[PDB]
């Protein structure tokens, strides 16, 4: 019949409440994995004391066969991924391990192959599956939430991961409007389309207000001098120029990029929907965002290329000579420009200024240039405002 997004199929694994985030993540693994759980839950103490690497090297190789459902496999990825970052970087002062012991590398790679995700911590692990409600009968607010794992005391990982998650959830409230958009275009329902675009804009405007909470829960000194170390990967990294050896799984060292919000499917989703061709051309920013799709869960990666197969919303609006429809489309693009402009100020506070008192991103190239290119591509998609 063809690529028609008239409904969001349950096979895309997009939750009605939390969107691309993992709904009600599992907190405990079966008892068989207690040795992994003790290490993952005590990374601040084990790293600070210099005992982390020895505790990891003492592990027996545990089979992944006892992780029988999706949520336990996602929790185990988050546990193994946090342990791997702590093992590779240690205290973060130049003494790096270039070989991941087989006792963790083998189950980590087996589980990563099973979930079609690389054997490195991704945004879907440390943001989308790394959370819980303190009280299940209370709403999804910062006060009623916590992360499952942190790297070091005072690293601000709770604030950084949770505010990223909250923004991600706020933007997700617009996903349910996508089938209304495609259906209104197919059925030539102008008023329905206009109303749907304004609702998407409203959601993206609310996501910016949610972002303001970053200042209360993250401090620049801790983010840049402490958390930054554990967010780093091994692709174009001079500290691990050939990548990491996953002992017992692969013969040669392998390179994988560190976790990135370029792996967020909700932001890539609205750029695709609005025809902001962030992945077009052969430039660095476009190549990076396309590359980050292979670091997203497979159903979410599938949702994005499915959106790309649908008719263009931008081309539909551009061809109508309808001021009301063009304004509603621009309200969506404007809300993304506003988010990106505010995020540039956040990056200046949390990265640029601390770095100046001491910038390359996950892609190995200047992060300010990447962000400004992404923002500029969005601003240039406005049909009028200039
Ligand atoms: C302490 C605050 C923050 C800092 C320092 C920060 C830093 C960065 C950096 C360095 C990048 C470039 C990509 C990379 O190198 O991995 C990036 C991209 C991005 N960030 Fe953040 N970020 C912050 C907060 C947030 C929050 C709360 C969100 C909400 C989900 C967010 C969403 C994004 C998105 C979607 C991108 C991809 C580029 C774009 O779509 O404009 N960031 N961020
Ligand atoms: C030179 O100094 C630095 C360079 C940097 F690249 C970073 N860095 C990288 C990320 C990453 O993209 C990220 C993540 C990941 C954990 C998955 N999660 C949420 C998020 C929101 N926006 C970005 N997010 N955030 N900061 C930090 C640095 F200090």
Q: What CATH number did the domain enclosing 234 receive?
A: 1.20.58.480
Q: DSSP secondary structure string, 8-73?
A: --GGG--BTTTBTSPSS------GGGHHHHHHHHTHHHHHHTT-HHHHHHHPPPPPSTT--SHHHH
> Pairing relation of β-strands 99-100 and 132-133?
unpaired
Q: Report if residue 7 sits inside a domain.
A: no
**DSSP state at residue 252:** S
**For the chain, what is the domain count?**
1
274, 381 in Cβ contact below 8 A? yes
76, 129 in Cβ contact below 8 A? no
Distance between CA 336 and CA 378 in Å, rounded? 7
Q: Report if residue 357 sits inside a domain.
A: yes
For residue 357, the CA-to-ligand 2 centroid distance in Å is: 19
CA dihedral (65, 68, 71, 72) positive or negative: negative
Tokens representing residue 365 in the block = 């190239």
246 forms bridges with which residues in the sheet? 100
Q: Report if residue 200 sits inside a domain.
A: yes
Cα 132 to the center of its chain, rounded Å: 17
Tokens representing residue 206 in the block = 């609310």
Tokens representing residue 239 in the block = 């500290």
- Helix H segments across the chain? 34-41, 43-48, 52-58, 70-89, 102-115, 123-126, 157-172, 178-186, 190-211, 214-217, 220-222, 228-231, 265-273, 284-292, 298-309, 313-318, 323-347, 353-356, 367-379
Q: Which residues in 243-260 are b (16+ Cβ under 10 Å) and which e?
A: bbbbeebeeebbbbbbbb
232, 361 in Cβ contact below 8 A? no
Resolution as reported, in Å: 1.7
Give residues (CB < 6 A) around ligand 1: 160, 163-164, 167-168, 211, 214, 218, 223, 260-262, 264, 267, 340, 343, 346-347, 350-351, 361-362, 367, 370-371, 374
Method of determination used here: X-ray
Cα 292 to the center of its chain, rounded Å: 9
- Confirm or reject: Cβ of 278 under 6 Å from ligand 2: no
Cα 215 to the center of its chain, rounded Å: 20
Q: Which residues in 167-192 are b (16+ Cβ under 10 Å) and which e?
A: bbbbbbbbbebbebbbbbbeeeeeee
Q: Find the distance separating the first CA and the last CA of the chain, reported in whole Å.
A: 41
Closest by alpha carbon to 203, among 296, 143, 269? 269
* Domain ranges, residue 106: 14-129+149-379
Q: Report if residue 181 sits inside a domain.
A: yes
For residue 261, the CA-to-ligand 2 centroid distance in Å is: 7
Q: Report if residue 291 sits inside a domain.
A: yes
Q: Report if residue 3 sits inside a domain.
A: no
Distance between CA 39 and CA 53 in Å, rounded? 10
Distance between CA 106 and CA 85 in Å, rounded? 16
Cα 246 to the center of its chain, rounded Å: 24
Residue 246 parent element (H or E) = strand 245-246
Distance between CA 376 and CA 371 in Å, rounded? 9
Distance between CA 313 and CA 330 in Å, rounded? 12
φ, ψ for residue 335, nearest 5 deg:
-60, -35
Q: Report if residue 163 sits inside a domain.
A: yes
Residue with tokens 């620049």: 220
Q: How many CA atoms lie within 13 A of 76 on its CB side?
A: 31
Nearest atom in ligand 1 to the alpha carbon of residue 231 is 16
- Confirm or reject: Cβ of 78 under 6 Å from ligand 2: no
Distance between CA 53 and CA 87 in Å, rounded? 6
Task: Report the chain's C-alpha Rg in angstroms.
Answer: 21
Q: Which residues contact 147 (CB under 8 A, 6 or more apart)?
A: 130, 131, 132, 157, 158, 161, 162
Q: Which long-range contacts (CB under 8 A, 24 or more apart) does 88-97 make?
A: 88/234, 88/240, 88/244, 89/229, 89/230, 89/232, 90/47, 90/52, 90/53, 91/47, 91/48, 91/50, 92/226, 92/229, 92/230, 94/239, 96/239, 96/240, 97/53
Q: What SS3 state is found at 233?
A: coil
Q: Report if residue 240 sits inside a domain.
A: yes
Distance between CA 73 and CA 219 in Å, rounded? 32
Nearest atom in ligand 1 to the alpha carbon of residue 271 is 40
Q: How many CA atoms lie within 13 A of 63 on its CB side?
A: 3
Tokens representing residue 229 in the block = 């170390």
What is the crossing angle of helices 298-309 and 265-273, to 10°? Answer: 10
Binding residues for heme b, as ranges, are 343
123, 295 in Cβ contact below 8 A? yes
141 C-beta neighbours (distance < 10 Å), count: 10
Tokens representing residue 146 in the block = 């916590």
Distance between CA 39 and CA 45 in Å, rounded? 9
Distance between CA 368 and CA 348 in Å, rounded? 9
Determine the Cα angle at 78 with ends 269 and 94, to 5°: 105
Q: 155 burial class (0-12, 13-18, 19+ CB within 10 angstroms)?
A: buried
Distance between CA 50 and CA 38 in Å, rounded? 16
Residue with tokens 């002062």: 93
């Amino acid at each position: 019949q063809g690529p028609h997004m008239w409904t969001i199929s349950k096979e895309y694994h997009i939750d009605e409440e939390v969107g691309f985030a993992l709904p009600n993540p599992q907190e405990n693994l079966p008892d068989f994995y207690n040795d992994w759980m003790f290490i993952a839950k005590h990374l601040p103490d084990l790293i600070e004391s210099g005992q982390l690497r020895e505790r990891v090297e003492k592990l027996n190789m545990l089979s992944i066969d006892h992780l029988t459902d999706h949520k336990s496999q996602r929790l185990a990825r988050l546990v193994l991924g946090c342990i791997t970052m702590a093992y590779v970087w240690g205290k973060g002062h130049g003494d790096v391990r270039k070989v991941l012991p087989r006792n963790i590398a083998v189950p980590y790679c087996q589980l990563s192959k099973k979930l079609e995700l690389p054997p490195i911590l991704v945004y879907a692990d440390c943001v989308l599956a790394n959370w819980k409600k303190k009280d299940p009968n209370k709403p999804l607010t910062y006060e009623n939430m916590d992360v499952l794992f942190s790297f070091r005391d005072g690293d601000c990982s709770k604030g950084f991961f949770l505010v990223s998650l909250l923004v991600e959830i706020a933007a997700a409230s617009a996903i349910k409007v996508i089938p209304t958009v495609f259906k209104a275009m197919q059925m030539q329902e102008r008023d329905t389309l206009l109303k749907a675009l304004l609702e998407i804009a409203s959601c993206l405007e609310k996501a910016l207000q949610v972002f303001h909470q970053i200042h209360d829960h993250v401090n620049p000194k801790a983010f840049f001098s402490v958390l930054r170390i554990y967010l780093s990967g091994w692709k174009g990294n001079p500290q691990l120029s050939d990548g990491l050896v996953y002992e017992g799984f692969w013969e040669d060292p392998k390179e994988f990029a560190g976790g990135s919000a370029g792996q967020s499917s909700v932001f890539q989703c609205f750029d695709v929907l609005l025809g902001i061709q962030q992945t077009a051309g052969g430039g660095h920013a476009a190549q990076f965002l396309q590359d980050m799709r292979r670091y997203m869960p497979p159903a979410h990666r599938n949702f994005l290329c499915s959106l790309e197969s649908n008719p263009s919303v931008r081309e539909f609006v551009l061809s109508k000579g309808d001021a009301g429809l063009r304004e509603a489309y621009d309200a969506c693009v404007k809300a993304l420009v506003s988010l990106r402009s505010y995020h540039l100020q956040i990056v200046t506070k949390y990265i640029l200024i601390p770095a100046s008192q001491q910038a390359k991103g996950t892609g190995g190239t200047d992060l300010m240039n990447f962000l400004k290119t992404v923002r500029s591509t969005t601003e240039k998609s406005l049909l009028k405002e200039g």
